[model samples]
Structure formats: C-alpha cells, structure tokens
Target: LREKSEKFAFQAEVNRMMKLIINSLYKNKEIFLRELISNASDALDKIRLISLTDENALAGNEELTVKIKCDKEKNLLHVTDTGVGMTREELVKNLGTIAKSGTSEFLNKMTEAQEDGQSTSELIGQFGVGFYSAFLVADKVIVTSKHNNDTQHIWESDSNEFSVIADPRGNTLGRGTTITLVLKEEASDYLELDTIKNLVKKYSQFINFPIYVWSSKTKTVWDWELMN
Candidate 1:
C-alpha cells in the first residue's frame, strides 16, 4: 500500500512545473483533438507495420478505425483506436521520463527549421509529444490497452503522477488503445457528440484510417437507437 501510494505521488517541483505548464502555457485548448487524432494515426501505423509479421494482429478489429465516445453522465470523452497498444514499460517510458537525447534532437530540428523558415508541423510530427496536450483539459485519464506480447493493462493518472496495473477487464479491444479523459467541469463542451464529430472532421478528415463518433439516433427499424 505504501509503494502504491508512493507511485502516485508527484515530486513537489514536478507538480509545480506541470501546474504552470497546463494552467498558463497552454494557449489553444482546441488543439487537443488534433493531437489525439494524430497519435491514433501513429498507433494505426505501428500496428500496420506489425501486421506484416503477424497476420492475425488485428483479428477482431480489422477496420483500422479511431472512435470518439462521449459519456455526458461521467463528463468523459474517450478517443480509442484499433491499433497497437503499449505495455507497462512502454507507458512508463512514454509518460514518466523524458529522454535527454530525444529533447535535444527535437530542439535541434526546430531551431534549424526556424533558421530556414521551414514549416513547424513536419518537425512537430517527428517529435511526437502532442498527445500529452490532453492533460490541459482533463483532470484524470485512464488508458486501457492490450499489446500483442503483454496482457491488457490500465494506466491511470492525473498528469502529476500515474499508475499502471493489469486490467481487470480482459482484452475488450483485442489489440488497441483507448484513452479516456475525465474532463474538467469547464471543459464539458467537448462531451457533445456533434462537437466531437465536427472536431474530427475539421482536423483529421483526411487521415488514412476511418474516424467514427459514437452517436445514437432514431431509426425506422427500432424505436430506440443504433450506434452510428
């Protein structure tokens, strides 16, 4: 229990730094949708490459899709993918520690691009930290994922600290990642189905994979609804 509590404890300075970054430095909040979509696209690409080695990699979900589900009651939004998922070690390396070389390389590329007046999007894509922007809007995040070699796991966090544990629910996605965002009360505007759909269309319509918004509408065959 002590170890578990320590795992969730953030260093005082690190917490202060994160608070400063999220509360002050983040300017355009709407960009979180774009970042999440871009990360999903990368995950899809990773699985596509893996499928070359293992034919049944995405056996259950072959659609190669990104889905956005909004739960109004919970004030949560989930961006999910039928793509490669991360293991616990991967999650720790990705979320907990930042490599010095990676930061140096990214900064060098950006500096050179600025000097040459080259576009920044290309540089940004190479660095690949956009998904972290979700912390700006969400107070808590739960990532449910299953990798090819590892059992499904859950990574839960509030940005300052995080924990990774074996998922109680089995592989619901076969092989993929689902990012659930427990939104701040002020960011509840993102919970609307229409808003999520429009955000995807505006930013990621041209992505190679299909993007879907979970919605229920009245249908002729049924009095209630259908997932559209």
Candidate 2:
C-alpha cells in the first residue's frame, strides 16, 4: 500500500513576505498576539457564514471558540480555533502562497520599509500579516487542521520552506485549526500565565467568540478558563 504523502514548495512571494514581516512591518512584538487572535476570530466568521446557507456545514463540531495554551517545558505555544478548517489544497494556497491581490498590492506599496517610525497595527485584516507574524518569536510553526470534507493534515515551516503531510493520528480535530509555535529561547516570556492574560485582554477582549486560556490556578491543578 502506498501512503498518501505530499510536499509542496512555498511560493516565492511567501518567502519575501515572511522576511519583510519579520524584519520590517511590525515593530512591537506584542502585536503578534493580536494578529493571531484576529485570524482565529476570522476563521470563526467563515464557519458561521457557511452555516447560514448550508445547515450541515457544522455537522460534527457545533462548538465555536478560540483556545490558547502554552507548554513551558517544551517552549511551545498553541492557538486553536473551533472554526472552518482548511482542506489540503486550501492549506497550500492559503499558507504556501499569497491568495489575495490586496495583500500582494499592499506589499508592493511598502516600497520604503517603515520609513517613518509608525506602528503598523492598522494593517490588520490582511491575512498574511496575522499568520506570518508568528515568526517574530517562534523558530518553527506547525498547523494541524481538519475540514468537514477532508481528513486532517499538518503544515509546518521554519521560514525556509513548508511541507504538508497527512496527520497519521487522524481526525483529532473534529473541525478546526490548531497552530503550534515552538518559541525561541529569548521569547520564553510569552509562556507566562499573566502575560497571556494581559495580552488577550489587551488585544482580543472584544472578539465575538469566547477565548479560553489553559491555566493553573493552584500549583497542582490545570484547567481552561475564559479570558474574554
């Protein structure tokens, strides 16, 4: 039997965009949290939109929310969303290539990089800004997602090239996306409970869906608590 495994090269534009984002556009590192939460919120919007026209769009997982968790020991941070997940092709197009012309056009417009010292938070709603900002703190990023019509798949990258492989564990996510960032040594401060609490409130407090943080109220017990 042949295994279903495939690897695709990221588009040239994606590589350039990653470099520009990591080195230029965003000056404040905290904005990464805001961009990611915005992406999760947008994912929720897509699923809800589809559910309006087709009742069965949310056949399996009816729950809709965003959850953030961190593993201090592993130096990992995970952002999970119970929303419309990507199919294999969608993953390649959305993650491996630039999909929107507006985003590409914006890139072209920024000819002189950050000429004036200004916060680029106004660049929200641009999909690439939200996803690629993960590179600011993470050395590697892993995204696992499952869509209603397709099986689970993993898309991972270390800023050079990205690969997509079928998730051997299969169907772990009923329907959603989970982005796991392996944080850099210097960025370890992101793993603190209070740090995340403040970030969520500061950035995503007004988000439509509930946002939960995996927390430890006591020294021994750990549970998911809503942050927004």
Candidate 3:
C-alpha cells in the first residue's frame, strides 16, 4: 500500500532522452549491475561516515550488504541493499535530474589524465548519477526504500513520468533500499543466476561489504536432514 504524491513529472525532453539512451547509448545492458553495485557501495560509505558521528548510526541495520534476486517468470531482477535509503526528495532530484556540466567536467578530467598517463579511477567517485544506468536494462523500475529520518517511500518509473509516494507497507526492510527491474525482452539473459553472480564478482567482489544471492537448491538429506 502506498499513498500517491502529485505524479512527479519529468523535464519535457526527458522522455525522448531516455528513449534514446535505452535504445541507442548503452550497448551492454549487463553494465546496469555494476552501476547498481557501485551505488550500493556509495550508500555503505555514507552510513560508515554517519557511524563515526553517531556510535549507533548503523546499529539497526549493520549488515551493510548487497543482494541480487532474479524472477525469471516475471522477467525481473532485483538489486537490494541494507544501507541508507533515500527520501522522496532525493528520489526526485537524483533520478529525475541530470548533472550536465559535471559530466563534461568528468570527461575533460578523464581525457587530461589519460594524456598525462595518470589513472582516472580515483575520479569515478566524484560523479553521482551512476544509479540511473539501471535504466539501461529495465524498461520499468520500482524502488522501495526507508530512511531513518523519514517514512518509507516507493519511486516508480518507466523512463517517463516517475512518481514518489509513501509506502504504506511500512519498512519491510529494517533499513535500506530495494530496486526492482522489469527487464526488457532482449535483456532476459540477465535473469540467469550465474550471469548475476559473475557480474557481481567482476564489479564488486572487493567492495567492503558482503554480497549474497538467493539460492534455489533443495535441502539435501546428506547435509541437514541426515543429521536429524
């Protein structure tokens, strides 16, 4: 159950821009996982900083982990976190808006660094819009989040008009955010568990938090039932 906010609108050209991005710009849809994992890592960094200020800042949800779940039947994939969730305003500003000049500055820096033979990896953190890359794989996205300072909210979008509404379900997660992706027909390969696991390992294995997957293996008698 969720309460509607006044149908959050997008900039006039945002729809056309999104369609161009979805259909043309991103060639490899799997990169969406990397973007999401990076965003989760950022969230963890935020909570880590808050913990230094408030000893029990992360006490309620200290797992600081990322989990991926695939729903093949629905052609959907979910990337979840037990880190700091966003407020409704954040959803609007971060997702609906784009940082035009910041991207240019980043590119210029990257080019300059490359020319000087210096590594540009250190500059990656300066950019804040990476999470939107999830749109590359998903036709529609649903974000359910709860922040310590605010009520739970749901941010839904189909690359068009997005809405941020109060989540009446109320804090299903003790803390953190969950992003559900409705995958495009061509992006069905992401539904494979192996694909997801490999992507996680490739991009985020070294992230200072545990990453997990929901396994579907049946309980084996040799392992547990046999002990009974």
Best candidate according to TM-score = 2
Clashing pairs in 3: none
Q: Model 2: per-residue lDDT, tens digit, 43-149?
A: 88989999999999888688899999988999999999988998988787556543232254545455444433132333223665656567778899898999888
lDDT of each: 0.71, 0.78, 0.68
Per-residue lDDT tens digits of candidate 3, residues 1-228?
897765345343464554355443266656667678877777777887788889877766767777778889989898788888888876766554432212434333333533223323332333323444566667898988877777789999887678889998877867788989998887888899778766777886536677777655455321111100
lDDT by residue for model 1 (1-228), tens:
453445434353464454346543267777777877877887899899988988888775676878888999989999888788888777765554322212434433333433223433443344234445676688998889887778889988886668989988877878888999999988889998778777888887535687877776554231211122
Rank order (by TM-score, best first): 2, 1, 3
Root-mean-square deviation of each candidate, in angstroms? Answer: 11.9, 12.1, 13.0
- Model 1 per-residue lDDT at 47: 92
In candidate 1, which residue pairs clash?
none
Q: Sort the predicted structures by lDDT, highest score first.
A: 2, 1, 3
Positional deviation of residue 205's Cα in model 3 after best superposition, in angstroms: 4.5
Better of 1 and 3 by TM-score: 1
Q: Residue 56 of candidate 1: its Cα lDDT?
A: 82
Q: How far in Å is the alpha carbon of 2 misplaced in model 2?
A: 57
The positional error of residue 13 in candidate 1, measured at the CA in angstroms, is: 19
